[PDB]
Design a protein around this ligand. Structure first.
Ligand SMILES: CCB1C=CC=CN1
Ligand SMILES: [Cl-]
Ligand SMILES: [Cl-]
Length: 161
């Protein structure tokens, strides 16, 4: 298990445009296309992302290419964020994957707002952090996924996957 296999479990793989848990047009392994309600707008973002006229369908190779880019972008975003980077650097590699998972799902804006959880994580108060992380819209709207990510923060193991 690693961050790629973790997010592949949490996000699935779909090769046609679909709506994510929030109703937003998405493709591949959780590649958000747009928050616009226009499917045509989503298809335009897809063509721009892939570099060809797709009409809403991509290959698994293409999905994995966007996925690798999106994981990389999530990490690089964490490392540019003054709130997230010190907490991320304080973590072991397994909990680092949990941090990337949250940023992948929620965006660095939003995760940087988890101020009290971030402090508990930096302090390695794992059970306290896990309790605070669940007091969130994130947990309430995607509880099974949030429980897996939280268990990874709580234990530093891959037991939930
Ligand atoms: C709140 C989880 B987290 C997300 C990025 C960096 C550190 N921690
Ligand atoms: Cl791209
Ligand atoms: Cl869920």
């Amino acid at each position: 298990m690693n961050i790629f296999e973790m997010l592949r479990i949490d996000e699935g793989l779909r090769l046609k445009i679909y709506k994510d848990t929030e109703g937003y047009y998405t493709i591949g392994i959780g590649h958000l296309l747009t928050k616009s309600p226009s499917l045509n707008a989503a298809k335009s973002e897809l063509d721009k992302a892939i570099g060809r006229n797709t009409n809403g369908v991509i290959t698994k190779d293409e999905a994995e290419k966007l996925f690798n880019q999106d994981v990389d972008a999530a990490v690089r975003g964490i490392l540019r964020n003054a709130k997230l980077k010190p907490v991320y650097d304080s973590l072991d590699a397994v909990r680092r994957a949990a941090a990337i998972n949250m940023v992948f799902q929620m965006g660095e804006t939003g995760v940087a707002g988890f101020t009290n959880s971030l402090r508990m994580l930096q302090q390695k108060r794992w059970d306290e952090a896990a309790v605070n992380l669940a007091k969130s819209r994130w947990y309430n709207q995607t509880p099974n996924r949030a429980k897996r990510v939280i268990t990874t923060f709580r234990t530093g193991t891959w037991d939930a996957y």
